[PDB]
Protein backbone atom coordinates (compact mmCIF):
# COMPACT_ATOMS: atom_id res chain seq x y z
CA UNK A 1 0.00 0.00 0.00
CA UNK A 2 1.16 3.52 -0.88
CA UNK A 3 1.26 5.68 2.26
CA UNK A 4 2.99 8.71 0.73
CA UNK A 5 2.90 11.35 3.46
CA UNK A 6 1.87 14.87 2.47
CA UNK A 7 3.19 18.08 3.98
CA UNK A 8 2.15 19.29 7.45
CA UNK A 9 1.83 15.71 8.71
CA UNK A 10 3.82 14.41 11.70
CA UNK A 11 5.99 11.34 11.24
CA UNK A 12 4.16 9.77 14.19
CA UNK A 13 0.75 9.97 12.51
CA UNK A 14 2.28 8.94 9.17
CA UNK A 15 3.77 5.79 10.70
CA UNK A 16 0.53 5.06 12.56
CA UNK A 17 -1.41 5.36 9.29
CA UNK A 18 1.08 3.02 7.59
CA UNK A 19 0.76 0.51 10.43
CA UNK A 20 -3.05 0.69 10.31
CA UNK A 21 -2.96 0.12 6.54
CA UNK A 22 -0.70 -2.91 7.03
CA UNK A 23 -3.00 -4.25 9.75
CA UNK A 24 -6.12 -3.87 7.59
CA UNK A 25 -4.29 -5.49 4.67
CA UNK A 26 -3.27 -8.42 6.89
CA UNK A 27 0.08 -9.02 5.22
CA UNK A 28 2.02 -9.60 8.45
CA UNK A 29 -0.52 -12.17 9.70
CA UNK A 30 -0.29 -14.21 6.47
CA UNK A 31 3.40 -15.12 6.87
CA UNK A 32 2.70 -17.01 10.12
CA UNK A 33 0.64 -19.46 8.03
CA UNK A 34 2.63 -19.29 4.76
CA UNK A 35 5.94 -20.04 6.54
CA UNK A 36 5.29 -23.80 6.51
CA UNK A 37 3.21 -26.39 4.66
CA UNK A 38 -0.17 -27.24 6.20
CA UNK A 39 -1.59 -30.53 4.93
CA UNK A 40 -5.15 -30.37 3.52
CA UNK A 41 -6.18 -32.74 6.31
CA UNK A 42 -4.84 -30.36 8.97
CA UNK A 43 -6.32 -27.30 7.26
CA UNK A 44 -9.79 -28.86 7.16
CA UNK A 45 -9.45 -29.91 10.80
CA UNK A 46 -8.54 -26.35 11.78
CA UNK A 47 -11.42 -24.93 9.73
CA UNK A 48 -14.05 -27.10 11.42
CA UNK A 49 -12.51 -26.53 14.86
CA UNK A 50 -12.81 -22.78 14.20
CA UNK A 51 -16.36 -23.11 12.80
CA UNK A 52 -17.47 -25.17 15.82
CA UNK A 53 -16.21 -22.52 18.25
CA UNK A 54 -17.54 -19.68 16.09
CA UNK A 55 -21.21 -20.62 16.53
CA UNK A 56 -20.70 -22.23 19.97
CA UNK A 57 -19.85 -18.70 21.12
CA UNK A 58 -23.11 -17.41 19.61
CA UNK A 59 -25.01 -20.44 20.94
CA UNK A 60 -23.75 -19.67 24.45
CA UNK A 61 -24.53 -15.97 23.97
CA UNK A 62 -28.14 -16.81 23.06
CA UNK A 63 -28.42 -19.51 25.77
CA UNK A 64 -27.05 -17.52 28.74
CA UNK A 65 -29.97 -15.05 28.53
CA UNK A 66 -32.38 -17.37 30.38
CA UNK A 67 -30.95 -17.82 33.89
CA UNK A 68 -27.89 -16.88 35.98
CA UNK A 69 -28.94 -13.32 36.82
CA UNK A 70 -25.39 -12.35 37.83
Amino acid sequence: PVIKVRENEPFDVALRRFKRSCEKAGVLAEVRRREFYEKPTTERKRAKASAVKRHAKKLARENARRTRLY
Partner: protein
Protein backbone atom coordinates in the same frame (compact mmCIF):
# COMPACT_ATOMS: atom_id res chain seq x y z
CA UNK B 1 31.09 10.95 -5.31
CA UNK B 2 27.99 12.69 -6.69
CA UNK B 3 25.28 13.69 -4.23
CA UNK B 4 21.68 12.64 -4.87
CA UNK B 5 18.68 14.67 -3.70
CA UNK B 6 16.21 11.76 -3.52
CA UNK B 7 16.61 8.23 -2.20
CA UNK B 8 14.84 4.96 -1.51
CA UNK B 9 15.57 2.90 1.61
CA UNK B 10 14.78 -0.82 1.49
CA UNK B 11 14.33 -2.55 4.85
CA UNK B 12 14.39 -6.35 4.46
CA UNK B 13 13.45 -7.70 7.88
CA UNK B 14 13.23 -11.34 8.97
CA UNK B 15 12.82 -13.48 12.08
CA UNK B 16 16.60 -13.72 12.56
CA UNK B 17 18.16 -10.61 10.97
CA UNK B 18 17.38 -7.23 9.39
CA UNK B 19 19.12 -5.50 6.47
CA UNK B 20 18.65 -1.88 5.40
CA UNK B 21 20.04 -0.57 2.11
CA UNK B 22 19.90 2.72 0.21
CA UNK B 23 19.51 3.48 -3.49
CA UNK B 24 18.99 6.71 -5.40
CA UNK B 25 15.93 6.11 -7.59
CA UNK B 26 16.56 2.97 -9.68
CA UNK B 27 17.94 0.22 -7.44
CA UNK B 28 21.64 1.10 -7.31
CA UNK B 29 22.87 0.45 -3.78
CA UNK B 30 24.83 3.18 -2.00
CA UNK B 31 25.08 2.04 1.61
CA UNK B 32 23.93 -1.06 3.45
CA UNK B 33 23.95 -2.28 7.04
CA UNK B 34 23.05 -5.49 8.86
CA UNK B 35 22.31 -6.42 12.46
CA UNK B 36 25.04 -9.07 12.27
CA UNK B 37 27.58 -6.36 11.50
CA UNK B 38 25.96 -4.00 14.01
CA UNK B 39 27.79 -5.73 16.87
CA UNK B 40 25.17 -8.42 17.51
CA UNK B 41 25.49 -12.18 17.05
CA UNK B 42 22.94 -14.98 17.12
CA UNK B 43 19.33 -14.33 18.05
CA UNK B 44 20.46 -11.17 19.88
CA UNK B 45 20.37 -9.36 16.50
CA UNK B 46 16.66 -10.17 16.06
CA UNK B 47 15.60 -7.54 18.62
CA UNK B 48 14.18 -4.22 17.33
CA UNK B 49 17.04 -2.42 19.11
CA UNK B 50 19.48 -4.22 16.80
CA UNK B 51 17.34 -3.11 13.85
CA UNK B 52 17.55 0.49 15.07
CA UNK B 53 21.34 0.17 15.44
CA UNK B 54 21.59 -1.22 11.90
CA UNK B 55 19.42 1.62 10.56
CA UNK B 56 21.53 4.30 12.25
CA UNK B 57 24.74 2.64 11.03
CA UNK B 58 23.33 2.66 7.49
CA UNK B 59 22.41 6.34 7.90
CA UNK B 60 25.97 7.09 9.04
CA UNK B 61 27.32 5.11 6.08
CA UNK B 62 25.45 7.35 3.61
CA UNK B 63 26.47 10.71 5.07
CA UNK B 64 28.74 11.36 2.07
CA UNK B 65 25.72 11.54 -0.28
CA UNK B 66 23.34 13.72 1.76
CA UNK B 67 19.93 12.31 0.86
CA UNK B 68 17.09 14.68 1.73
CA UNK B 69 13.83 13.14 0.42
CA UNK B 70 13.60 9.44 1.30
CA UNK B 71 11.01 6.80 0.45
CA UNK B 72 10.94 3.68 2.61
CA UNK B 73 10.04 0.20 1.36
CA UNK B 74 9.53 -2.44 4.05
CA UNK B 75 9.72 -6.16 3.27
CA UNK B 76 9.32 -9.05 5.69
CA UNK B 77 7.66 -9.76 9.05
CA UNK B 78 10.48 -8.55 11.28
CA UNK B 79 10.50 -6.67 14.58
CA UNK B 80 12.36 -3.81 12.89
CA UNK B 81 9.52 -2.77 10.56
CA UNK B 82 8.94 0.32 12.75
CA UNK B 83 12.30 0.66 14.52
CA UNK B 84 14.21 1.05 11.24
CA UNK B 85 11.75 3.66 9.95
CA UNK B 86 11.82 5.70 13.17
CA UNK B 87 15.63 5.52 13.28
CA UNK B 88 15.81 6.76 9.69
CA UNK B 89 13.43 9.60 10.57
CA UNK B 90 15.44 10.54 13.67
CA UNK B 91 18.73 10.47 11.73
CA UNK B 92 17.73 13.75 10.02
CA UNK B 93 16.38 12.10 6.85
CA UNK B 94 12.92 13.23 5.71
CA UNK B 95 10.52 10.49 4.59
CA UNK B 96 8.34 11.21 1.56
CA UNK B 97 6.64 7.86 0.86
CA UNK B 98 6.11 4.68 2.88
CA UNK B 99 5.28 1.34 1.28
CA UNK B 100 5.21 -2.30 2.43
CA UNK B 101 5.77 -4.56 -0.57
CA UNK B 102 6.12 -8.12 0.74
CA UNK B 103 6.33 -11.22 -1.48
CA UNK B 104 3.00 -13.01 -1.14
CA UNK B 105 2.89 -16.24 -3.19
CA UNK B 106 -0.55 -16.87 -4.68
CA UNK B 107 -0.44 -20.56 -3.74
CA UNK B 108 2.84 -20.96 -5.60
CA UNK B 109 5.81 -23.09 -4.58
CA UNK B 110 5.17 -25.54 -1.75
CA UNK B 111 6.63 -24.31 1.57
CA UNK B 112 8.78 -26.71 3.62
CA UNK B 113 7.27 -29.25 5.98
CA UNK B 114 6.11 -28.53 9.52
CA UNK B 115 8.89 -28.69 12.11
CA UNK B 116 8.11 -30.99 15.04
CA UNK B 117 9.93 -29.19 17.84
Amino acid sequence: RKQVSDGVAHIHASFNNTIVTITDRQGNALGWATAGGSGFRGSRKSTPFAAQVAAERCADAVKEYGIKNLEVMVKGPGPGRESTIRALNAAGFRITNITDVTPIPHNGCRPPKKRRV
